[PDB]
Amino acid sequence: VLTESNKKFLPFQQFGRDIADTTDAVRDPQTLEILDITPCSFGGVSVIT
Amino acid sequence: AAYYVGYLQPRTFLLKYNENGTITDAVDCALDPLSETKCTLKS
Ligand SMILES: *[C@@H]1O[C@H](CO)[C@@H](O[C@@H]2O[C@H](CO)[C@@H](O[C@@H]3O[C@H](CO)[C@@H](O)[C@H](O)[C@@H]3O)[C@H](O)[C@H]2NC(C)=O)[C@H](O)[C@H]1NC(C)=O
Secondary structure, three states, X not given: OEEEOOOOOOOOOOEEEOOXXXXXXXXXXXXXXXXXXXXXXXXXXXXXX | OOOOOOOOOOOXXXXXXXXXXXXXXXXXXXXXXXXXXXXXXXX
16 A cells, blocks of 8 residues: 655665565655555454354 | 775675664674674664
């Protein structure tokens, strides 16, 4: 899920990676703006019976 | 006019990226034993 961020990217830096080597913030190639990357919601499903 | 030449060395380095993403402080792991502990402890 994308979202506008507030991470100052340096002119040569385009992708911001996470601890697990996953990109958690990107700069759009067309409009030089910083976006926020967040995985879509997930979770276990438990059936109560 | 004065110009220095600090020849670079291939050496592991503990960069402390600040809240803003700019390296503020650092530790040279091979400088001395105390620095080496900091790198191993990652602190
Ligand atoms: C990374 O950038 C942020 C935002 O500037 C820094 O956050 C801290 O935010 C407060 C409130 O903005 C700063 O107080 C002051 O803010 C006014 C503007 O609101 C500014 O004109 C003052 O000079 C003063 O900065 C606070 O100072 C600021 N932190 C620092 C160290 O200035 C955040 O600190 C920045 N990270 C680093 C490591 O500098």
